Amino acid sequence: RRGALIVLEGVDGAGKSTQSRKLVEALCAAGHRAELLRFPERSTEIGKLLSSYLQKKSDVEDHSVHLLFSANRWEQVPLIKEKLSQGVTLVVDRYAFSGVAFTGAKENFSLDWCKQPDVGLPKPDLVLFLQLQLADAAKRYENGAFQERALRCFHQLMKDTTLNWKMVDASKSIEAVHEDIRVLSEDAIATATEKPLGELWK
Amino acid sequence: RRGALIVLEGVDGAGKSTQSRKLVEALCAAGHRAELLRFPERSTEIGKLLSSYLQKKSDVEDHSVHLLFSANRWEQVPLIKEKLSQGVTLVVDRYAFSGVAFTGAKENFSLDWCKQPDVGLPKPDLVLFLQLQLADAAKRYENGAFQERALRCFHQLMKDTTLNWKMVDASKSIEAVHEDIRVLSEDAIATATEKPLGELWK
Ligand SMILES: Nc1ncnc2c1ncn2[C@@H]1O[C@H](COP(=O)(O)OP(=O)(O)O)[C@@H](O)[C@H]1O
Numbered sequence A, B: 001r002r003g004a005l006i007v008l009e010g011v012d013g014a015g016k017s018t019q020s021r022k023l024v025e026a027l028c029a030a031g032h033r034a035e036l037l038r039f040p041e042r043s044t045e046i047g048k049l050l051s052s053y054l055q056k057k058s059d060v061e062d063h064s065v066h067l068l069f070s071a072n073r074w075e076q077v078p079l080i081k082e083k084l085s086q087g088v089t090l091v092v093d094r095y096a097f098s099g100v101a102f103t104g105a106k107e108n109f110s111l112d113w114c115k116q117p118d119v120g121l122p123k124p125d126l127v128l129f130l131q132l133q134l135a136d137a138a139k140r141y142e143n144g145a146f147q148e149r150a151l152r153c154f155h156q157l158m159k160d161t162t163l164n165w166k167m168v169d170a171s172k173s174i175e176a177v178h179e180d181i182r183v184l185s186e187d188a189i190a191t192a193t194e195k196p197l198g199e200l201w202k
């Protein structure tokens, strides 16, 4: 009985890390086997450079840094498939969508070129998109103009009806948003998993 | 007056590094400005890991290592475009084709998925393919079966008539193959450059 692959997405400040941490805690307290993962995962060899990049300690050519973010997801694919096969539901703080939304926010980056590297990644069973006004996120790639461009790509990605997108009202309290996400998650773990793990964008 | 982008391709042992080195030397002695580059370029941050991988000092998930080879080309794109704009012809020992031929040689790697990361790279003005029997290369990804699979992909790539592919009989002596390549190169530098630098596979 496989685990569910559940991803949280949204702009900076939307609540993804807080709600990812709290989701894994609730699911585990309710007797599920569930573990947290995040992208980029700065602890691997590839991840160290993404961190540095993001921390503006290094300049990496724009297509090069896009590909390093994707390669960082692929290096975790064997772990990802192994844990899911063992019944472990994985809660993932950012995935390919952020990947495309942040690079696709840049000039001369077609969404098509940006999606290719991640074509074939484990397909999430549920994509939670933590929605909130930009000005509310800000009060909590990190500048106003860049966040608004990324949000636009996110909206272009959510037209892909092959994915199980759920909107979450991220402007509520931590606890209210958490209960919304918990209930959606329990449902995906119970029914969305009857089908074999899919492939992203293919 | 831009420089030409000239790439050499072929299986292991075909002569590419020897003929790349000798081409840059001849062109320079004939008053051209020309410089050598090679892929992977193991000296950058990304390149160190590819080297290690190839030297079997590290195991990198198959899609991850494919993307690192591509990212290694993209990080050199600003240098590449700058030198060409300054009139410097670049001789390149392996490029995107080897990239696709060696990953595309693996199981479950469509040529389509393998080409995407490199879509948009500077397009070579001339691709020299150093042709020779596998058994001759061998006497000089490195095993018989892997080389023959890569050669098959190379043949699938050469059907792309948008590229200026030239076959070179790599079974002749070093000097004979060199003169063949020199003459083809002088012609590309003199006429193939009247057009702006293109974009690979787009
Ligand atoms: N619902 C919420 N209401 C108010 N503040 C919140 C809420 N969710 C998270 N925060 C705060 O906002 C900041 C960003 O939260 P975080 O979960 O790190 O967001 P993200 O990972 O999406 O950037 C943190 O200080 C966090 O405590």
Ligand SMILES: Nc1ncnc2c1ncn2[C@@H]1O[C@H](COP(=O)(O)OP(=O)(O)O)[C@@H](O)[C@H]1O
Binding pocket: B010, B011, B012, B013, B014, B015, B016, B017, B018, B019, B140, B170, B171, B172, B173, B174, B177
């Ligand atoms: N035309 C040739 N005939 C015989 N040996 C050759 C010829 N070209 C190169 N070699 C030898 O074959 C080996 C591989 O050459 P190299 O240029 O490194 O090939 P590649 O870079 O394609 O792997 C070297 O020892 C080289 O001296």
Ligand SMILES: Cc1cn([C@H]2C[C@H](O)[C@@H](COP(=O)(O)O)O2)c(=O)[nH]c1=O
Binding pocket: A012, A039, A040, A054, A069, A070, A093, A094, A095, A096, A098, A099, A100, A102, A103, A141, A142
């Ligand atoms: C996962 C991912 C994140 N990003 C970005 C979004 C954030 O600005 C940044 C750090 O993410 P984080 O705040 O979730 O750690 O990296 C990319 O640009 N590409 C990617 O593939």
Ligand SMILES: Cc1cn([C@H]2C[C@H](O)[C@@H](COP(=O)(O)O)O2)c(=O)[nH]c1=O
Binding pocket: B012, B039, B040, B054, B069, B070, B093, B094, B095, B096, B098, B099, B100, B102, B103, B141, B142
């Ligand atoms: C350029 C490139 C080479 N390769 C391979 C071909 C060789 O087996 C290896 C070393 O190349 P080399 O002998 O030209 O240094 O790397 C890839 O697998 N992908 C790539 O993008």
Ligand SMILES: [Mg+2]
Binding pocket: A016, A017, A018
């Ligand atoms: Mg976060």
Ligand SMILES: [Mg+2]
Binding pocket: B016, B017, B018
């Ligand atoms: Mg060589």
Ligand SMILES: [Mg+2]
Binding pocket: none
């Ligand atoms: Mg396509």
